[PDB]
Symmetry: C3
């Protein structure tokens, strides 16, 4: 279970990093947003 | 601890999926955004 | 591993809560968004 949870957490870390970048871009209006 | 962490990770997966849908909608301007 | 995963999950919970607040603000146009 721990091996599977670790993979799930790592996938979440990647997805959350991507969301943070997109949301900061929206908040800041970067690149014409 | 693992049982509680698993529930926390599953809740995160649901929340992150929801955020991805909302952020793609904002980025794409879907439905008048 | 479980101790490290727990810290990672807790950090994700904080980041996801922050994203939910920012995305709701964008969706609702709060504060001039």
């Amino acid at each position: 279970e721990v091996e599977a949870l670790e993979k799930k957490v790592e996938a979440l870390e990647a997805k959350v990093q991507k969301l943070e970048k997109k949301v900061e871009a929206l908040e800041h209006g970067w690149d014409g947003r």
